[PDB]
């Protein structure tokens, strides 16, 4: 069985649920932001969202451009298991849900 799977965290307020999404593209590869947005629309049927990743310090970081996406993939701490999972995981939030960000000094 040869499906590649992107695991995504889908947030309702500060708790997420997990959904694994079939992706044709190579496990090694770097998507464009616009393609991740179209993937999230097909799977969750909304466009009022932001995409994010969690950095090495534990802070959630909003993706705003293709270059941010490339940083996410580059930092990716995933070990290849036999599960065919992308090594980075996508965090999806309501665009006005600011409670998920560690912005407090």
């Amino acid at each position: 069985h040869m499906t590649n799977w992107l695991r995504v965290y889908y947030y309702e307020d500060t708790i997420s649920t997990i959904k694994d999404i079939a992706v044709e593209e190579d496990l090694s590869s770097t998507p464009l932001l616009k393609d991740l947005l179209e993937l999230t629309r097909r799977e969750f049927q909304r466009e009022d969202i932001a995409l994010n990743y969690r950095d090495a310090e534990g802070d959630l970081v909003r993706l705003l451009s293709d270059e941010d996406v490339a940083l996410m993939v580059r930092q990716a701490r995933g070990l290849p298991s036999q599960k065919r999972l992308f090594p980075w995981k996508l965090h999806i939030t309501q665009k006005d849900n600011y409670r998920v960000y560690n912005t407090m000094p």
């Binding site: 310090e57 802070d59 940083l71 960000y101 912005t103 000094p105």
Partner: protein, 82 residues
């Protein structure tokens, strides 16, 4: 210059991360944060945490060098008011 890669992490209503050169002047740091957050320059009000403080202090031309002294693991963290 340095062989390492530095970032600016900025906490606005949301958090962003961008590549930076270490030691940039305030004018350029403000400008890059303003562009990243799609904010008018004049509405881009940044602060940093000084050595061993719980309190933030305003970022400015004058305090920029001190701010760069607070880099941790190749990252300078700033806060953007609002």
């Amino acid at each position: 210059g340095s062989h390492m890669a530095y970032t600016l992490k900025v906490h606005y209503k949301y958090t962003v991360v961008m590549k930076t050169q270490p030691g940039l002047p305030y004018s350029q740091v403000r400008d890059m944060v303003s562009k990243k957050l799609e904010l008018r320059l004049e509405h881009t009000k940044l602060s940093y945490r000084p050595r061993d403080s719980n309190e933030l202090v305003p970022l400015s031309e004058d305090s920029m060098k001190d701010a760069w002294g607070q880099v941790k693991n190749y990252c300078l963290t700033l806060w953007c008011e609002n």
